[PDB]
Amino acid sequence: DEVWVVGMGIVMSLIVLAIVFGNVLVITAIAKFERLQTVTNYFITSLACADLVMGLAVVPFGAACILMKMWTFGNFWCEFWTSIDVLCVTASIETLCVIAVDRYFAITSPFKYQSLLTKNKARVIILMVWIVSGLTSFLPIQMHWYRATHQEAINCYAEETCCDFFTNQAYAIASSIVSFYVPLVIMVFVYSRVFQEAKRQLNIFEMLRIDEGLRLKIYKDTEGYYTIGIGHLLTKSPSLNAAKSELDKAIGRNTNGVITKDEAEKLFNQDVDAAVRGILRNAKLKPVYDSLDAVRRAALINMVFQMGETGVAGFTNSLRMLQQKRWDEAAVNLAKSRWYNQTPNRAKRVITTFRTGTWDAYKFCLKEHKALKTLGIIMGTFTLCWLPFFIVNIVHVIQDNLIRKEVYILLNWIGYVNSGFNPLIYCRSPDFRIAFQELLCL
Ligand SMILES: *SCCCOc1ccc(CCNC[C@H](O)c2ccc(O)c3[nH]c(=O)ccc23)cc1OC
Ligand SMILES: CC(C)CCC[C@@H](C)[C@H]1CC[C@H]2[C@@H]3CC=C4C[C@@H](O)CC[C@]4(C)[C@H]3CC[C@]12C
Hints:
Elements: H1 4-32, H2 39-67, H3 75-107, H4 119-142, H5 151-158, H6 169-200, H7 204-213, E1 215-220, E2 226-229, E3 232-235, H8 240-251, H9 261-281, H10 285-289, H11 294-307, H12 309-313, H13 316-323, H14 327-335, H15 338-342, H16 344-356, H17 367-393, H18 395-398, H19 405-417, H20 422-425, H21 430-440
Antiparallel strand pairs: 1-2, 2-3
The chain binds the ligand *SCCCOc1ccc(CCNC[C@H](O)c2ccc(O)c3[nH]c(=O)ccc23)cc1OC and cholesterol.
The site of cholesterol has 11 residues, from helix 1, helix 2 and helix 4.
């Protein structure tokens, strides 16, 4: 329609605003707050910068090319605007590829979740990406190599009102493979091993870390006695001074009240051995425990850490079916109890662990695993927004004039919106959520 162009213009203007305002907040939160100045966040700034240049130099000039159906900026800016457009995509895919490699080397490292690259060394990697991007995008466009031999393409380059990206079969293969396909193959494969290592990390300590909760300070439990770390009872005495004398005796140093993650893991290993021996000494728990595998053994220990050996022995109907290796039948009995009524979220994970015999119930539940899931969506969003364009671009090489001009522009425009997608996905992390609130005054 006639007035439809005006209506679509307001929609496209809000997209430009969503990309700029969104990415500005990401770059500002990292630079202003010292809290978010990590090695990975330095690449996030580089990723947000590449998305910012899109919404300032590519997206506003790109939207105007549809509103008037022609170019009103000149042949000089037409070549420059196209050069930035490819540069921003080339840098983004390479930065996301670097993050995938960086996260793999941090997860496999003995000092887990800590990047091997230093602040000064990471800044070089950012510059290495932009220089390689400039050599692969700016050079083939400015120093003409993309120009097609056919007359239909020549008419567009000659015209001052035409800025359609007509490319030869040699460049169309090179620009798709080097600036998109090759970094995508590495990004998908390497980050798949990152999720594989997250599944490898799943242990008895990590299971109770989500269920009970690791607490470095001395706290009074549900009963009233002094507890520390993961369900480790210090003393039954109501005096706090008695707990401090036991805490120093259990570790071997002056604690004063606060301990560490590694020392809490050491105390848990002392408690887990006492729990297993407590089950073996028990007349009812011992025959059931012998008929449980390594993963399912941990689900029974999880119950003992919550209520105790006498409490778990009370589940007469549940234990009889667990010993017989009937998982689906015992799951109903375990759900029909006081344990499920008091702690529903905890029981749901434990019962599902008994059902399958896998740690799949504790997927993306840890503080570290949620951060890996967040970065995984950034890689997933860029793929699902750019791949439908790049997969269609190869069809033009196979069959000439098959895909419509409206189809080519729309699929290219899906990747334009992707620049403003990332800041909204960054809101998932609680560290960034506090940074955006204090900056915008909420
Ligand atoms: S102003 C002309 C009418 C509107 O249509 C457009 C024409 C041209 C563009 C910019 C071209 N898009 C580049 C594309 O995103 C891209 C990126 C990266 C790589 O490696 C590419 N390789 C290719 O072979 C082809 C395209 C590539 C935008 C328009 O829409 C506003
Ligand atoms: C403009 C074209 C040519 C490329 C621009 C690349 C720019 C945006 C890249 C390259 C170097 C990068 C910077 C490297 C160092 C830092 C300091 C750090 O504490 C926050 C991120 C920050 C600030 C990066 C921001 C993004 C950055 C400035």
